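Re-running the complex after MR caught last week's input typo. The corrected sequence lines follow. Everything else is unchanged.
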Amino acid sequence: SQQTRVLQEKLRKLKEAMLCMVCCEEEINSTFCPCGHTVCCESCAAQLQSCPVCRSRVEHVQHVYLPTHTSLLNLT
Amino acid sequence: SQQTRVLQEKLRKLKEAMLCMVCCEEEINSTFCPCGHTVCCESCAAQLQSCPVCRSRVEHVQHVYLPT
Ligand SMILES: CCc1noc(C)c1Cn1ccc(C)n1
Ligand SMILES: [Zn+2]
Ligand SMILES: [Zn+2]
Ligand SMILES: [Zn+2]
Ligand SMILES: [Zn+2]
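Corrected-run output:
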């Protein structure tokens, strides 16, 4: 029904929000510290000097294990 | 249709995975450091000395700003 299409759209949008803001391909699994923005995969987060969201200096990257992780890179 | 019911269940399970594993009421927004388990809201995370997933000591809690 049309209701099925509405639910599919909601699911798709939530799943897209879980992807890296730089490559758009890998799941987010890294936090810029100390600001806390958690918007990149490990590869894309590795070379950024400053946060792509708030411009704060990145002192280090903290890896995050989330319950919503479903990619092979994060389930292994 | 039956697919509407299946999709509602998938959405419910994804939304439950986004909620704190301790209180089940508030969204996850906190990481236990250094282990990295990101499974609690700020109120439950503040009250735990050990990670509830891996039992590692919590040195400190990092707030996470997620696209959620
Ligand atoms: C990076 C995780 C993420 N980004 O967008 C959504 C939606 C998520 C899923 N998520 C896991 C825990 C929480 C609060 N949201
Ligand atoms: Zn990336
Ligand atoms: Zn930031
Ligand atoms: Zn909680
Ligand atoms: Zn842990």
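None of the earlier attempt is carried over here. The longest helix of chain B spans residues 2-17. The interface with chain A takes residues 1, 3-4, 7-8, 10-11, 14, 17-18, 21, 28, 31, 33-39, 53, 62-68 of chain B (CB under 8 Å).
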